[PDB]
Design a binder for this molecule. Structure first.
Ligand SMILES: *CC(=O)c1ccccc1
Length: 229
């Protein structure tokens, strides 16, 4: 039976509303008075980060800060502005100010806790993951927190899922994974629930076992899988 529910963090938990304008403001802070359109810088940054994230999926862990600093070094060299030595801190300030959970998250996590193992699985480094959970006040809502840094590899490499299952003491067939962007979990027998809040991730629909738009649907799926629907 299903004894554990794992959440893809931060994707299933943290709102992305307004993030494009937040990232535009980061680029404005990088540039200052430099005569480059911040939207042009943002678009080029997003191209390079897309490339990097595609490259690193399934590969050994590398720190995000190192990756993003490399991207910014390349862009500063390309466009002629001074490399922002504090780019990471500029970005972190933005994420601290505007981090915000989706409105149903806390009650869903509390509804599952104690009845099922409630786990978090993330590609974030461990320090970043813990700081995220603490900033949003939900660290104690998880029974396990499993990172790419601990496993050694980024999703969708199976090691991170194997480690999460071992921490919980459950088999894959006893677990659900709620995912935001599953390029993985099913290699280990886990049941996959894709969270698609806007009904826009059709490239992931067909491999998912279930698709939901709101995490309150997760409870109802787990109940059904356990014969209590
Ligand atoms: C990217 C960005 O500005 C952000 C990310 C997470 C939380 C808040 C803001």
């Amino acid at each position: 039976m299903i004894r554990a529910v794992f959440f893809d963090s931060p994707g299933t938990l943290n709102s992305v509303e307004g993030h494009a304008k937040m990232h535009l403001k980061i680029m404005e802070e990088v540039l200052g008075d430099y005569p480059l359109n911040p939207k042009t810088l943002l678009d080029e940054y997003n191209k390079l980060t897309r490339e990097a994230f595609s490259n690193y999926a399934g590969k050994p862990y590398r720190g995000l800060r190192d990756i993003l600093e490399e991207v910014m070094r390349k862009l500063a060299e390309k466009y002629g502005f001074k490399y922002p030595e504090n780019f990471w801190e500029i970005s972190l300030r933005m994420s601290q100010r505007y981090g915000e959970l989706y409105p149903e998250v806390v009650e869903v996590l509390k509804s599952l806790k104690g009845k099922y193992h409630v786990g978090m699985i993330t590609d974030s480094g461990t320090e970043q993951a813990m700081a995220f959970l603490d900033a949003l006040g939900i660290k104690d809502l998880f029974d396990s927190i499993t990172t790419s840094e601990e496993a050694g590899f980024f999703k969708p490499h199976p090691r991170i899922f194997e480690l999460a299952l071992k921490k919980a003491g459950v088999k894959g067939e006893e677990a659900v994974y709620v995912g935001d962007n599953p390029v993985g979990s099913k290699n280990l027998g886990m049941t996959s629930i894709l969270l698609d809040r806007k009904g826009e991730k059709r490239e992931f629909w067909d491999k998912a076992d279930f698709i939901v738009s709101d995490l309150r649907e997760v409870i109802k799926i787990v109940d059904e899988l356990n014969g209590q629907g």
